[PDB]
Structure 1
């Protein structure tokens, strides 16, 4: 076939019921994730090809960067609760991997302040039980699929994108193949 299990995707031998339609995992410490977000714009190109009526979810993970990795997961929960993902994703990636000016939760906080979220609003969110459950959701989703590496994308709790099985000669072509694969899987 043109799309083959174990080639452009793998199947979860242990499917996850009730999972988000399209579920992406990343870490601000993850070098391919940086590529995916700032160079390849994967999330965005997937969305452009997804059918009507299909939601995209993106979660941060704990297993990179130790203590700061966990702060970043809580910060991402804040970003999601406040709906400010599109304002912090780039400065967080660059603060961690490019300029390396993020070394503590306070530095993470500075990124939101600079993006124009108010101190009082950020601190209130950071400490809220709505953010606590949002952290729990991120962890539970990763746990459900026994997640050990990022970037990762899962469709309908049953299929897992396998980007190693795609050409990377051309970055544009890789992205569309990736996006088309997600669409194929979504229609399965």
Structure 2
């Protein structure tokens, strides 16, 4: 069958989930963001959680700081009843501003971190110190550790990469359509 590979070990804190490993510099990731792929999967599968895993080796010079901002967004979205499948989540808004920066606003280079960091902080209506205080917590360090698996996940087939229940990574060649992706997420989430 080869429609998926099994990750070993499983991704932590992944049960009942679809994880999308993505880059803000990837056209395919941008197209899935604009299309609302994760929102559509929530329409089909309201009991699954949807999470973004940024791929730091594809996210350029300020990739570590981008991972920090996504860890904060993931944290805060849990406090607010949202995940990455809601357009008004902090995770979706944060992905949106960086996709807009790169694909609409032609920004490739920043001469220092704070020009880059400020885009994310403005999208989430927070400041650098609020993010720094969150980063200095065991739970933030745990979320950032989880994102380290995104790099090898992305290398297998490219981005985006969809992972079901922390275990089953979908081969992009196995699907043509949104409904093909839904059907495979159903099969894998019921294994």
For the superposition of Structure 1 and Structure 2, which TM-score range results when normalised by the shorter chain? 0.7 to 0.9
What residue in structure 2 maps to residue 153 of structure 1? 162
What residue in structure 1 maps to residue 56 of structure 2? 62
How many angstroms does 1:163 deviate by? 2.4
Task: Verify: 1:118 aligned to 2:157, yes or no.
Answer: no
Measure, in 1, the Cα distance between the counterparts of 2:75 and 2:108: 21
Summarize the Cα distance change of 1:132–1:103 in structure 2 as closer, same or farther, 3 Å threshold: farther
What residue in structure 2 maps to residue 90 of structure 1? 96
The TM-score, its normalising length taken from structure 2, stands at 0.74
Match of residue 165, structure 1, among 162, 174, 180: 174
Measure, in 1, the Cα distance between the counterparts of 2:124 and 2:102: 19
Summarize the Cα distance change of 1:30–1:69 in structure 2 as closer, same or farther, 3 Å threshold: farther
| Structure 1: gaps spanning 5 or more residues | 168-173
- Note if contact 1:49-1:180 (Cα within 8 Å) is conserved in structure 2: no
- Secondary structure of the 2:25 match is coil
Query: What RMSD, in angstroms, separates the aligned Cα atoms of the two structures?
Result: 2.6
How far does the alpha carbon of each residue in 1:99-136 deviate from its partner, in whole angstroms, 9 at most, with x for none? 133633323333245436133xx332145223343222
Measure, in 2, the Cα distance between the counterparts of 1:116 and 1:24: 20
How far does the alpha carbon of each residue in 1:24-46 deviate from its partner, in whole angstroms, 9 at most, with x for none? 211112221111111x2111111
The TM-score, its normalising length taken from structure 1, stands at 0.75
Task: Verify: 1:37 aligned to 2:33, yes or no.
Answer: yes
Summarize the Cα distance change of 1:24–1:116 in structure 2 as closer, same or farther, 3 Å threshold: closer
What residue in structure 2 maps to residue 170 of structure 1? none
Alignment: residue pair count: 170
How far does the alpha carbon of each residue in 1:68-107 deviate from its partner, in whole angstroms, 9 at most, with x for none? 2232222212222333223222111111232133633323
| Structure 2: gaps spanning 5 or more residues | 78-89
